[PDB]
Amino acid sequence: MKIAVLPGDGIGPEIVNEAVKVLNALDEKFELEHAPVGGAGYEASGHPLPDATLALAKEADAILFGAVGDWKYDSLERALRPEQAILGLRKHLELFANFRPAICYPQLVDASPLKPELVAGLDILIVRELNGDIYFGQPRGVRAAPDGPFAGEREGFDTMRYSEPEVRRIAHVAFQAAQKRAKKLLSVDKSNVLETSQFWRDVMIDVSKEYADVELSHMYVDNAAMQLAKAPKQFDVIVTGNMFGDILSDEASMLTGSIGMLPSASLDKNNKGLYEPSHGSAPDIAGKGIANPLATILSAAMLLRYSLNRAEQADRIERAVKTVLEQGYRTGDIATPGCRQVGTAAMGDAVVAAL
Amino acid sequence: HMKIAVLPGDGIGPEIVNEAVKVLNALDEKFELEHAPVGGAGYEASGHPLPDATLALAKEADAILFGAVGDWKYDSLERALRPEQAILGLRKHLELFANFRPAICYPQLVDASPLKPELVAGLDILIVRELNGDIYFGQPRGVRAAPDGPFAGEREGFDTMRYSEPEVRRIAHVAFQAAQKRAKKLLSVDKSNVLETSQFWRDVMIDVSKEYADVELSHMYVDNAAMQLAKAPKQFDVIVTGNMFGDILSDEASMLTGSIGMLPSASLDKNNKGLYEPSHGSAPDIAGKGIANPLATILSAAMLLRYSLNRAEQADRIERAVKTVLEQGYRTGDIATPGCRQVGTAAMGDAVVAAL
Ligand SMILES: NC(=O)c1ccc[n+]([C@@H]2O[C@H](COP(=O)([O-])OP(=O)(O)OC[C@H]3O[C@@H](n4cnc5c(N)ncnc54)[C@H](O)[C@@H]3O)[C@@H](O)[C@H]2O)c1
Q: HEC profile for A274-324?
A: EEEECCCCCCCCCCCCCCCCHHHHHHHHHHHHHCCCCHHHHHHHHHHHHHH
Which of A156, A160, A246 is nearest residue B200 as measured by Cβ atoms? A156
Catalytic residue among B111, B203, B223, B316: B223
Q: In whole angstroms, give the CA distance from residue A19 to residue A300.
A: 6
With 0-12 CB in 10 A as exposed, 13-18 as middle and 19+ as buried, what is B229?
Answer: buried
- Ligand 1 atom closest to the CA of B193, numbered from 1: 43
Helix (H) or strand (E) holding A99: strand A97-103
| Residue B83: cis peptide before it, omega within 30 degrees of 0 | no
Query: Cβ(B135)–Cβ(B244) under 8 Å?
Result: yes
Q: In whole angstroms, give the CA distance from residue B303 to residue B312.
A: 9
Tell me whether strands A97-103 and A263-267 are parallel, antiparallel or unpaired: antiparallel
Return binding residues of B for substrate: 91, 101, 129, 223
Nearest CA-CA distance, residue B146 and chain A, Å: 7
Q: In whole angstroms, give the CA distance from residue B90 to residue B50.
A: 8
The answer to whether B200 faces chain A, any CB pair under 8 Å, is yes
Q: In whole angstroms, give the CA distance from residue A240 to residue A129.
A: 6
Contacts of A222 in chain B (CB under 8 A): 247-248, 251-252
Query: A5 C-alpha to center of ligand 1: Å?
Result: 19
Q: Is A263 in the pocket of ligand 1 (CB under 6 A)?
A: no
Query: Cβ(B108)–Cβ(A108) under 8 Å?
Result: no
Count Cα neighbours of B297 within 13 Å in the Cβ-side half-sphere. 32
Mutate to test the interface with A, among B97, B119, B148, B231 (most CBs of A within 10 A): B231
Of the candidates A273, A259, A300, the one whose C-alpha atom is nearest the C-alpha of residue A20 is A300
Query: Cβ(A69)–Cβ(A283) under 8 Å?
Result: yes
Query: Cβ(A298)–Cβ(A317) under 8 Å?
Result: yes
Of the candidates B79, B84, B80, the one whose C-alpha atom is nearest the C-alpha of residue B69 is B84
Residues 294-323 of A with CB under 8 A from B: none
Domain boundaries, chain B: 1-356
Residue pairs spanning A and B at CB distance below 8 A? 187
Solved how?
X-ray
β-partners of residue B35 are B6
| Residue B14: cis peptide before it, omega within 30 degrees of 0 | no
Q: In whole angstroms, give the CA distance from residue A300 to residue A17.
A: 11
Of the candidates A256, A235, A130, the one whose C-alpha atom is nearest the C-alpha of residue A188 is A235
Of the candidates B168, B187, B198, B190, the one whose C-alpha atom is nearest the C-alpha of residue B97 is B168
SS3 B353: helix
Residues 66-95 of A with CB under 8 A from B: 69, 74, 78, 81, 83, 87
Nearest CA-CA distance, residue B226 and chain A, Å: 5
| Amino acid occupying residue B114 | P
A135 is catalytic: yes
Q: In whole angstroms, give the CA distance from residue B117 to residue A68.
A: 35
SS3 A7: strand
For A1-355, the fitting CATH number among 3.30.540.10, 3.40.50.800, 3.40.50.10380, 3.40.718.10 is 3.40.718.10
SS3 B340: coil
What's the reported resolution, in angstroms, to a tenth? 1.7
In 10 A of CB B270, how many CB atoms?
Answer: 15
Q: At what angle do helices B345-354 and B312-327 cross, to 10 degrees?
A: 120
Q: In whole angstroms, give the CA distance from residue A127 to residue A108.
A: 23
Helix (H) or strand (E) holding A64: strand A62-67
Contacts of B12 (CB under 8 A, 6+ apart): B67, B68, B282, B283, B286, B287, B288, B292
Across the interface, whether the CB atoms of A161 and B158 are under 8 A apart is answered: yes
End-to-end CA, chain A:
21
Query: Cβ(B204)–Cβ(B171) under 8 Å?
Result: no
Helix (H) or strand (E) holding B86: helix B85-93
Return binding residues of B for Mg(2+): 223, 247, 251
Q: DSSP letter string over B130-165? A: E-S-STTT-SS-EEEE--SSTTTTSEEEEEEEEEEH
Contacts of B182 (CB under 8 A, 6+ apart): B126, B237, B238
Contacts of B158 in chain A (CB under 8 A): 137, 159-162, 195-196
Q: In whole angstroms, give the CA distance from residue B323 to residue B319.
A: 6
Query: Cβ(A248)–Cβ(A188) under 8 Å?
Result: yes
Query: Cβ(A105)–Cβ(A322) under 8 Å?
Result: yes
Q: Place domain B1-356 in its CATH homologous superfamily.
A: Isopropylmalate Dehydrogenase (3.40.718.10)
Across the interface, whether the CB atoms of B227 and A87 are under 8 A apart is answered: no
Q: In whole angstroms, give the CA distance from residue B60 to residue A188.
A: 42
Q: In whole angstroms, give the CA distance from residue B218 to residue B133.
A: 23
Query: Cβ(A57)–Cβ(A93) under 8 Å?
Result: yes
Q: How wide is the angle at C-alpha A100 spanned by C-alphas A98 and A101, nearest 5°?
A: 140
Of the candidates A303, A281, A117, A66, the one whose C-alpha atom is nearest the C-alpha of residue B114 is A117
Tell me whether strands B142-145 and B98-104 are parallel, antiparallel or unpaired: unpaired
Q: DSSP letter string over A161-219? A: EEEHHHHHHHHHHHHHHHHTTTSEEEEEE-TTT-HHHHHHHHHHHHHHTT-TTSEEEEE
| Residue ranges with strand state E in chain B | 3-9, 32-35, 63-68, 98-104, 124-130, 142-145, 155-164, 185-190, 216-221, 238-241, 264-268, 274-278, 330-331, 341-342
Query: Cβ(A113)–Cβ(B118) under 8 Å?
Result: no
Tell me whether strands B32-35 and B63-68 are parallel, antiparallel or unpaired: unpaired
